[PDB]
Amino acid sequence: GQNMRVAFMPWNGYNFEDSILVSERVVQEDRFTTIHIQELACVSRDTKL
Amino acid sequence: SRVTTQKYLHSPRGIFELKYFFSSHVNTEGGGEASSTAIRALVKKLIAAENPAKPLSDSKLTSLLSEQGIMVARRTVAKYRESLSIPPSNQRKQLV
Amino acid sequence: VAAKDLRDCLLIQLSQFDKTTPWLEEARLIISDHLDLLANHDFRTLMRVTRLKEDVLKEAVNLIQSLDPRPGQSIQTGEPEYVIPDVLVRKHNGHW
DNA sequence: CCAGAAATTGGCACGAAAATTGCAATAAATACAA
DNA sequence: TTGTATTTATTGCAATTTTCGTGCCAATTTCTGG
């Protein structure tokens, strides 16, 4: 994971019932950006014609 | 004749009918025979590599074939071209 | 779609173009009046009847050929049909 | 540019050659009873 | 030991029809030189 500076306090109901409030700098610094790779296939077969 | 009827052969090239391998022939130069399938393939290749401004007529195709040894008549070349579903020379030219 | 023939389909497709198209009128004239001799690849009697030039007739022909001949093939539905071969020929350790 | 020719194309024909299709009740090897 | 009934093995000929390449020639298509 990543090391995050965290404070334990209620903030206007945005951490109500396990919700998490995240700063914009975390998104700006690409700290939780992930790469996902997908594969697609095309098969050429032999027909009668 | 009976065995080779409607039975298909699978080869790395494709699927054939086991009667696709029986064909007529024309005389070549010096001695031998040339199959009609080979001549059809040669005609298709020569037509596919022509000048779009002036297409090859049947006389020119016959002259080109009669350099490799094949002795095929003009009418036979026309028949092969018709069997290949290729329009005549005047219907293959383009304005380019 | 739902066109009676090729001329009707081409005219329908050409009637949706804006008037700003450089060669719309010449292509419309060719499609409406002289299409049989365009199929015949005349390209010379077409010049006489339409009274155009090579650099304009070629553009009109290219505009016509930029149209879609089969409108209903946008939605393709079906499946290719295969056969089960009766005999298999392959290459093993340098022989057939 | 206008005839007239020269070229191109495809229908029909010909004799050979190739391919297709209809046959309908047999001959020998072998185990076996006299 | 031998004539006899049973079980295999038989997958080709001979017609008839189709297809072959290539020539003849009328009807179109392009070319040329005056």
UniProtKB/Swiss-Prot annotation, chain A:
Acetylated on several lysine residues in the presence of glucose. Transmembrane segments: none annotated. It comes from the Bacteria. Changing E17K: Disrupts the enzyme's active center. Co-administration of salinamide and rifampicin or salinamide and myxopyronin suppresses the emergence of resistance to both antibiotics. The RNAP catalytic core consists of 2 alpha, 1 beta, 1 beta' and 1 omega subunit. When a sigma factor is associated with the core the holoenzyme is formed, which can initiate transcription. The rRNA transcription and antitermination complex (rrnTAC) consists of RNAP, NusA, NusB, NusE (rpsJ), NusG, SubB, ribosomal protein S4, DNA and precursor rRNA; S4 is more flexible than other subunits. In pull-down experiments interacts with CedA. Belongs to the RNA polymerase beta chain family. DNA-dependent RNA polymerase (RNAP) catalyzes the transcription of DNA into RNA using the four ribonucleoside triphosphates as substrates. This is DNA-directed RNA polymerase subunit beta. It comes from Escherichia coli (strain K12). The chain holds residues 797 to 845 of 1342 of the full protein.
Curated annotation (Swiss-Prot), chain B:
A motif (RPON box) lies at residues 73-81. Belongs to the sigma-54 factor family. Sigma factors are initiation factors that promote the attachment of RNA polymerase to specific initiation sites and are then released. This sigma factor is responsible for the expression of enzymes involved in arginine catabolism. The open complex (sigma-54 and core RNA polymerase) serves as the receptor for the receipt of the melting signal from the remotely bound activator protein GlnG(NtrC). This is RNA polymerase sigma-54 factor. The gene is rpoN. The chain holds residues 382 to 477 of 477 of the full protein.
